Write a protein that binds this ligand. Structure first.
Ligand code: SF4
Ligand code: NA
Length: 344
DNA sequence: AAGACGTGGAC
DNA sequence: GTCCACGTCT
């Protein structure tokens, strides 16, 4: 009863659609940026970042031409920073390989880094009208309730199944609208907790509602790392920072020099990291920072740095008022915050 | 197949 | 505390 389903869904969407910043138009760049920003991030969090980011990088080409530090700094605080290194690389490739036009073919677009099955669907359906499914966590919830699908959401195959369902029931007349409506339904009505079934526009089609199980769907299924962090100031009040490797945790972000210590075993593995001259006094605060897959237990040790050689490697001597220029992870932003109200 | 990869806010 | 949060890449 897909034509039935479509009308009721599409009609609700026309009345209820939020005026989000990225819905001002269907510019593929604009759509693409927002969809990358919205991955594992709440709409409310994204709104300010999207605006500053577009203000700063108005077009695809502006973004491609920007320094990566510039781009990381625009992302600073959003999390999952490889989203933006991927977006940046991908956007560079569209400029050069595709004349600056986001490819409207699913296979070509999917090949860009950071661009996966969901992003292909979202961007190409919204921006160009391509009939590809755009199945996110939202959509998976909706479809898992509509169709009483009890496969584990984490399984790669479950997503494939959902996409089949979309290809079957999608309004091919208007795929962007259909895809966006499915998403908005998940965002506003068919919510993780307490879905608003009595108000849902597609309730008559929904099995979970008829079975009394809306809330139990979809079905679905961390290590500790101790860290010592050094804040080292000149007599000129210039602070020692460093850029992280381009691979792995918090890639390419700047940090106050640190190392994993495994147990509260000293400030010496800190004082060790030489290659220039430092004595370290007693630590001033200790807090912890959660990631998705680990927790940092941080201890920050204030210190005095003397120059006895050049500054190379990934380290860099930044004066105090220039720290605000670099992208720091939130954890290391707090390290600095504590260090400063300390020195009061 | 499943772990890496941030962050903040509702509950 | 938990869940959001499949999103993508590995
Ligand atoms: S009826 Fe309840 S469960 Fe079924 S789609 Fe609408 S909100 Fe989701
Ligand atoms: Na890809």
């Amino acid at each position: 009863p897909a034509r039935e389903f479509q009308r009721d869904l599409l009609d609700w969407f026309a009345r209820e659609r939020r005026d989000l910043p990225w819905r001002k138009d269907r510019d593929p760049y604009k759509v693409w940026v927002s969809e990358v920003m919205l991955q594992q991030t709440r709409v409310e969090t994204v709104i300010p970042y999207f605006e500053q980011f577009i203000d700063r990088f108005p077009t695809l080409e502006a973004l491609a031409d920007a320094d990566e530090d510039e781009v990381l700094k625009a992302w600073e605080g959003l999390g999952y920073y490889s989203r933006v290194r991927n977006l940046h690389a991908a956007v560079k490739e569209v400029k050069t390989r595709y004349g600056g036009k986001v490819p409207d073919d699913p296979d070509e677009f999917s090949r860009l880094k950071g661009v996966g099955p969901y992003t292909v669907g979202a961007v190409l359906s919204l921006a160009y009208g391509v009939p590809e499914p755009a199945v996110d966590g939202n959509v998976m919830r909706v479809l898992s309730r509509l169709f009483l699908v009890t496969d584990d959401i984490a399984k790669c195959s479950t997503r494939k199944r959902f996409e089949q369902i979309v290809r079957e029931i999608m309004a091919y007349e208007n795929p962007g609208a259909f895809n966006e409506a499915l998403i908005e339904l998940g965002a506003l009505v068919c919510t993780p907790r307490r879905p608003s079934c009595l108000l849902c526009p597609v309730q008559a089609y929904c099995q979970a509602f008829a079975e009394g199980v809306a809330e139990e769907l979809p079905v679905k299924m961390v290590k500790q790392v101790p860290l010592a962090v050094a804040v080292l100031a000149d007599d000129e009040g210039r602070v020692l920072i460093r850029k992280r490797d381009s691979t792995g945790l918090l890639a390419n972000l700047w940090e106050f020099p640190s190392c994993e210590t495994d147990g509260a075993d000293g400030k010496e593995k800190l004082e060790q990291m030489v290659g220039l001259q430092v004595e370290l006094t007693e630590p001033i605060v200790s807090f912890e920072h959660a990631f998705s897959h680990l927790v940092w237990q941080l201890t920050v040790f204030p210190g005095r740095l003397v120059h006895g050689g050049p500054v190379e490697e990934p380290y860099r001597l930044a004066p105090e008022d220039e720290l605000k220029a670099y992208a720091f992870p939130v954890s290391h932003q707090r390290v600095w915050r504590e260090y400063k109200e300390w020195a009061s």
